[PDB]
Design a protein around this nucleic acid. Sequence first.
DNA 1: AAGACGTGGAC
DNA 2: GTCCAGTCT
Length: 344
Amino acid sequence: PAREFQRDLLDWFARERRDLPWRKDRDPYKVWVSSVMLQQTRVETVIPYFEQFIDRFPTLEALADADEDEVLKAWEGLGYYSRVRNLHAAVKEVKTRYGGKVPDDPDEFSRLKGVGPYTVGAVLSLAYGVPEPAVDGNVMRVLSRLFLVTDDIAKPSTRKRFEQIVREIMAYENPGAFNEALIELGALVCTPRRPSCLLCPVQAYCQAFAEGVAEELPVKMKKTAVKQVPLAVAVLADDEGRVLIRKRDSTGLLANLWEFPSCETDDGKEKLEQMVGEELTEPIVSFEHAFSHLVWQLTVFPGRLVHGGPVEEPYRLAPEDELKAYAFPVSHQRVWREYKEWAS
DNA sequence: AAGACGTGGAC
DNA sequence: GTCCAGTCT
Ligand code: SF4
Ligand SMILES: [Ca+2]
Ligand SMILES: [Ca+2]
């Protein structure tokens, strides 16, 4: 019953829609930035980053024209940093190739780095009205419960089945609003735990609620335990208070972020002294830091730096006052905090 | 295919 | 502790 379902959903949306910062206009640049920031990141976390980012980068061209270091700093702490490297590249392409206009063609837009199926649907359906589905985790959960889809949603194929269902039940009249409303429904009503089925605008059309199994959907494979990785970190300061930091490679974990020199140890002090050579004191703190796919076990070693030559790349000698200008991962932000607390 | 890829809320 | 808010390879 598409029309009945749509009306109960979209009337709910008009009433309950959150007035979020990226909903102030249907501008493709701002829908694109927020769509990328929101990937694997909760709305409440994104709000301050979005506001600061758009303030610093009001247009696609200001983003394209900005130095990679400035764009990364604006992303500092949000996680999954290849999102912002892909976005930066993708806007650069859009300025270079397309004269600064965001393509409204799905296949041309998706050629851009970072633009996967959700981001295509989100930007094109809201900014330009293109009736492409925008299936995020919220939408998969909603559709799994509605149509009692018990397949693993982690499989790409399941996602392709959801995307077909959307095109069938979609309100082609108001696609942008249909897509936001499904997302918003999963965010506000059809939540992972204890979904508010009784309050839900579409309790009638839900096969899961009818069978009493809303809480058992969606079907998501259980995450496997992650590798543990010991990491020795040096905080090396000369007599002028300047600190040695380095820029990580553009490929892999925490790409192009700055860090304090570090070595995967699997004795730390010996490897660190050996690495920076190519004298440290005892450890001052040891803490863990989680990633999605591994856990760092960090150990911080204070050090003294005497200048015997030029500071070569990737390294840079940073006055303590100028550390604030570099983008560090959260793990190394804590390294610096613990080093400064110890110094007190 | 499924591992890589950050981080922080809410249970 | 578990869960979970997308894309590239
Ligand atoms: S009735 Fe419940 S399970 Fe079905 S769409 Fe609404 S909130 Fe989700
Ligand atoms: Ca794509
Ligand atoms: Ca690398």
